[PDB]
Design a protein around this ligand. Structure first.
Ligand code: FMN
Ligand code: FMN
Ligand code: FMN
Ligand code: FMN
Ligand code: FMN
Ligand code: FMN
Ligand code: FMN
Ligand code: FMN
Ligand code: 4LR
Ligand code: 4LR
Ligand code: 4LR
Ligand code: 4LR
Ligand code: 4LR
Ligand code: 4LR
Ligand code: 4LR
Ligand code: 4LR
Ligand code: K
Ligand code: K
Ligand code: K
Ligand code: K
Ligand code: K
Ligand code: K
Ligand code: K
Ligand code: K
Lengths: 207, 207, 207, 207, 207, 207, 207, 207
């Protein structure tokens, strides 16, 4: 397979819960193992913006997402916000790529400063120290200078800052097509196959 | 009226021509005077992403947009890319707010470095030196460190960096609802009334 | 009216609870709408330094402060520390000026780094990104280099750093006169009328 | 009225005393209240470059300028260089816009470093801390890196650096027309009406 | 006595709980007063890495540690994570040296940014502002650039960054000898006598 | 004795002359030798804010302060603003701690830039180069970025920035109790005994 | 002869075409060889601000300027904007001093960033790399922070930033006298004799 | 095979010679080719801290280490400190990963500054310029700001700073278990299999 076998997928409390659920679904369809983390605020976002009725506790959440996605037993792990016995908490874990989608400005801040206050933040700290892939998907507008400095610091350290800023150059017809644009770029970044977004100009030879 | 009487609206060659056309339409409906500039690349974007058949030359373009938007005679000015006799080229002009929507990474760069190679770039240079409003609406993903440094520099100088990163917390049902989210935030930034996006929590008293 | 119609007033756990209560009282007397937030540590400060017996929960706190201040029904809103449905949590809210009085070194830090861990910190993050007024009133001595760097960063971004450092040039006779000095400068900063502190030299013509 | 009711006008010892006297005259004609400060070196410049015989002491200077300008009694205040009882010395004063015209490199330095050695320098320090308008009009050539760093620091803090560098694009015919160009840009910066310099392109609709 | 009479000893959730317990034991044997703080994560580390069954609540923990160490009544104080009435929370307290051993990357971050979210972090903030000794003992590998920037900032402000990186130049024979190496260097840093690690070259006169 | 035998006490022209006079009184009561310096502006502040009728010339001022404070002959030295033969002007002098209380923004600037224009500024320059204690007590609000950069630079070089920002956590009942709070913190900083402000939590053992 | 034998004189599209034409005339009268470059925008400025009817193409322009200035055949070279075979394009050319007069903000930007988009910009890039004289004469007001950073960078690298900011201390009587002031300072900078501006104080011996 | 076929292993004169010998042994057992370099000071460390009697000259050292490790002929190359004909001296060499274990503060400095004074330092310079793996294993405590700046610079350039700071979370029972912890993390960093340190949480599915 091309790309990572295991992805840590963290959802934090920015608007755009649809992006994180669609990415989860694509990762599952690509037979990847997902270590799923979700913040309390992201739970409130998902309740507000979607009709997904996500259970609160990790085992119930795991059972629910496995069914929602059509996943295999064991394919989605769920870990709670203080579960330091989970693989993402240590750099001695097997290597995973990590994506924070969506990424709140508060989570962006914590990652940029090294605040390590829950498993999402620690997981990101471990990805950086181990030089494992780290993709942040912020959703905010305007971005203040606070936000921008935090994104620049992490981009300079090799994190990929991938704003939830979809393109329109494949004539999107629905909200889903815009969601899938962003998801496709995340999968592209990770080196995971996707067929939602064609390869630009692949068939163009000259002019 | 609340907000500026005159807006310089520059469209550059990032994906998201729909945002610039919808903002133009809203500004016209709010009885504002618009000084419209468009780059050659933005013309190619508009041809690719939309069914708007925009004429190439400024007078024909002006006639076309006046009709497209339902504007009054004289309400949309169009100026070509080297027209230094246009108001935006000089800080001795009457004051305008300026929005670059969408803003390509190349236009972002030119504004951040002071490159003054066409009227859009000069207009932005004048807005900064005169401390007149300047709003950039970049559409790109990932953002590299190049992009982020350019956005940070301009944000620190009082430009508003407003990525084309719509929210989902009003349960959007169509591409248009996402377009209108971004447009609403631009109008909010400018201090121009809009009723596309409600005032969050306006009716919430306690808890 | 001169100055903002709505002020977000956040009290955090620095010494100087008297300043925040007096400012609240002045804002109420000036017929402003106040969105009141208070941290858990600020509750402990208020219990230690004052004889105000503030209820713990937002609705009871709202009822209590409305009575304490002589406010109109609805004039003081109180929002709890995780209430993301409150106006201050979103930049799509109606615009407010925000004052953090007093501002702990920990809240100063969170605002400077963009940590967004409760509604006070998120509210400040939103004020900065929206270029809405943000006034911090730190109370600390000595200030370390940590403190000073955090204040400088925010001052450079247009926040007003207004230490709780009263002047003596109007011959204060009581603790209240010193409290009112600081409050007056906050109201001056906000553009709200006050008659506690005269306009210096207003009547001086020459020499 | 558009623009500030009160301007603090400080003349320092750069060449270009004509600019400061013409601005004073325009401000008076626009019915503004002027708080006038002049350095000892600026007195020597005025004696060298002009035929204005300015008295040395503040009351005599005030009487003289009131007559020279056709001002109303009380409209021009003059304050001496150590008069800390004057409004500009305190941020608790009524708000004024401040212009230093012309601005010597030494005054530029003092403002950039916060040196507070006379009332002009303190007044500028107060304008910055209160986020009241501050316009500096340097006259120097070449500018060294010392000069440029000082101007950049203050520009980054929201001061307007407006060099005495007139334009020629309205075909000036006299020294006075060049003086009036610079004065017009200062008044433009302050938001005060002026009809010396037309609004560029105001009548240009297309091309 | 040489060295401080009172040490604030904070244990945070890095691996190396043995270092903190051994330092506590040495401090007790040197008749020092210890103000002991421990984070929730450090409690989980101690449970995982050692057979010390530490009670959870401060009074029970105090009784337990007094017995474990052979301490005098009152010699070990224990304070909970929000106990702002404890001496370390205020710079008006009697002076203490502070050691964070072990120091997690998250606690390192909080100290470097001034986040003041529990008593350990506030205590460190107070040590820095009062220019009282502050020793951090990080245990992490690799160190990322996040970690290193945080350590550099604090080292530049006079904190001692003392990694849990034992030496081998006294031919250690056990895990305990390595633990005691690090502890000895902490005591050396604090100016407290120790005889675990000889003074290098003390008896070497020439060559 | 604990703390320095000799303190250079400089009063500059910020509001808060009461702080400097009370500190002088405490230092005298602690049998310290004081080298007293006062700026011309500080003389004007003392005349405005207090009923102390301080003579202008150093010998008369010395006689006056010796009486005002109950000092021993020779215990208060007074030196004029250009007296380079005074001990504070040279690092070859016997070592003193220096406190600038209150510290104007102009004196803060001069110390931060090394301007050495009077004996107070030179004395501070000498304290820094000799790594002798230097405590600045600024009184200003808001602090601008100018102020904050100057304070940060000096704090990074080991000066203590101690704003005149009293605490309220010992339930102050008078202006004097607030003055004494600040004075106590200065004496704490210097290592001089004081009993105005208790040691926080000294009697708290657990919880 | 004192000063350079060859000057590259580039005119760019800032207001102040009179300065560039007068400098050209003085250089010709001093028997210097001039390599003349002019941007398209500078052609539009010259048409607007002057009655010089400058031909568009380099050979016609050369013939025209030779006549306008009274120059010898071959004394004024003109090179077009993409003529890389011209001496200024290579550092292996014979050495020239270069002056950009007037210098637009866009040309200032290009030189500061190394953009090399036409022969003027490349010529400046070559002057810097060869440590040959480079004088920029900007004409703009206000200068923004963009402008100032670009000028500072180049000043730090040894370029001379000489704003078109004439002095008045030789009692100018006409627009020409102000033009000649600036020209004189450029010639002074280059080490070329001029008698338009006397040597200040040359005859002053004492006082 | 996973990971690099060739590792340049440099031992420098920090304490911790055991780490370098154990890593050498593991690399040999994993059938990797090792290019071994050792500094003169590291020879003195090995003599002091271990009972390995390492010959001084490269051929004798090679024979000795081949036997000590059970290596194949040709599997360990040894190169002397000025042998510029060795592969590590040139980026045109076949690619190797490089580890400096242990890394003295002096070698850390040389690598950070580009000092190229022996083959170890040149080899590291080549690894950085070729973007080949470079892992430094410093052993020092405290780390000064000198050390930390050097580590930060190299970490920012993509070197891995892996302090000799073992963890205790697998209940180490001997000095060897601590040595093997660090070695395992180096092998993890390099992508070489190891079974000394389990993959954290690999078997944890939920909670
Ligand atoms: C409905 C809703 C939408 C939100 N949208 C955003 C958003 O788009 N971006 C953002 O940075 N925060 C947003 N927030 C706020 C955060 O959720 C808040 O700052 C929180 O502290 C983030 O915490 P977390 O990073 O632990 O998830 C939203 C909150 C809610 C309830
Ligand atoms: C269909 C199309 C879509 C594009 N989308 C983007 C985009 O989303 N962001 C971007 O920075 N550039 C985009 N580009 C590229 C630019 O248009 C290109 O870099 C151009 O030089 C911008 O020039 P301008 O700033 O003068 O408009 C796009 C180009 C085309 C043709
Ligand atoms: C009585 C009392 C007084 C305090 N005084 C201060 C103070 O003056 N400045 C400060 O930064 N923290 C002070 N603190 C500490 C904070 O309250 C503490 O650092 C807390 O974490 C701040 O949290 P908050 O920012 O969420 O309110 C005080 C605490 C108490 C209990
Ligand atoms: C006739 C004359 C012209 C001057 N022209 C300038 C000038 O153009 N720019 C400048 O920075 N200083 C000029 N100076 C010098 C200053 O006046 C001098 O540096 C002085 O210290 C400025 O002090 P001030 O800032 O208190 O006015 C001039 C002085 C005189 C006497
Ligand atoms: C068994 C165990 C070992 C840990 N080892 C480390 C470590 O060596 N370094 C580290 O920075 N964090 C380590 N952590 C993680 C932290 O404990 C986590 O990031 C936590 O948020 C730190 O919180 P604290 O600073 O409040 O103690 C470990 C956690 C556990 C459970
Ligand atoms: C009554 C009075 C009160 C003042 N209060 C302050 C103040 O609180 N802070 C300040 O920086 N300057 C204050 N100033 C201004 C200064 O005294 C002024 O900037 C002066 O140049 C300081 O000079 P010095 O540093 O030599 O004492 C005050 C002046 C007077 C007359
Ligand atoms: C009449 C006229 C006057 C101008 N005045 C200025 C000016 O004073 N300063 C400036 O930076 N640009 C001025 N401009 C704008 C520039 O000419 C424009 O930004 C252009 O892109 C500069 O290109 P160039 O650097 O290749 O000459 C002026 C333009 C015209 C037409
Ligand atoms: C026994 C011994 C132990 C040493 N331990 C260390 C150490 O732990 N860290 C360190 O930086 N230097 C240590 N040094 C010092 C260095 O070896 C010394 O600074 C040397 O110049 C390093 O040179 P190199 O980098 O060429 O190996 C030690 C030296 C000896 C003899
Ligand atoms: C949860 C845990 C074992 C953290 C330690 O991991 P690492 O050694 O810091 O990568
Ligand atoms: C097009 C034109 C007149 C540019 C000059 O404007 P400004 O004086 O630089 O603001
Ligand atoms: C609570 C909420 C709707 C946060 C999103 O606000 P914004 O779009 O980030 O200004
Ligand atoms: C002259 C005077 C009262 C200075 C104090 O003003 P502010 O409180 O520093 O703004
Ligand atoms: C817990 C408490 C009294 C904090 C205030 O201490 P300090 O005045 O900030 O050193
Ligand atoms: C007044 C005097 C002797 C200044 C010289 O002191 P130092 O040698 O600069 O410390
Ligand atoms: C036009 C040309 C030969 C450019 C190369 O010049 P140089 O070697 O870069 O100074
Ligand atoms: C020892 C040698 C051939 C050094 C040159 O290598 P490279 O071309 O600098 O990578
Ligand atoms: K959470
Ligand atoms: K174009
Ligand atoms: K709270
Ligand atoms: K003066
Ligand atoms: K805790
Ligand atoms: K003085
Ligand atoms: K051109
Ligand atoms: K060597």
């Amino acid at each position: 397979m091309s790309g990572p076998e295991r992805i840590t997928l963290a959802m934090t409390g920015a608007s755009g819960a649809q992006y994180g659920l669609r990415l989860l679904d694509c990762l599952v369809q690509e037979e990847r193992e997902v270590h799923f983390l979700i913040s309390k605020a992201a739970q409130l976002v998902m309740a507000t913006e979607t009709d997904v009725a996500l259970p609160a506790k990790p085992q119930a959440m795991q059972a629910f997402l496995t069914e929602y996605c059509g996943a295999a037993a064991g394919q989605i792990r769920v870990f709670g916000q203080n579960d330091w016995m989970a693989p993402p908490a240590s750099g001695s874990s097997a290597p995973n790529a990590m994506v924070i989608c969506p990424c709140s400005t508060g989570t962006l801040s914590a990652v940029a400063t090294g605040a390590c206050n829950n498993l999402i933040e620690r997981a990101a700290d471990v990805a950086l120290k181990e030089r494992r892939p780290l993709v942040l998907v912020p959703r905010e507008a305007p971005f203040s200078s606070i936000h921008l400095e935090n994104m620049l610091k992490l981009s300079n350290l090799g994190a990929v800052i991938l704003p939830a800023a979809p393109g329109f150059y494949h004539q999107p017809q629905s909200v889903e097509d815009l969601v899938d644009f962003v998801v496709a770029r995340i999968l592209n970044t990770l080196g995971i196959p996707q067929d939602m977004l064609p390869r630009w100009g692949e068939q163009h030879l000259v002019s």
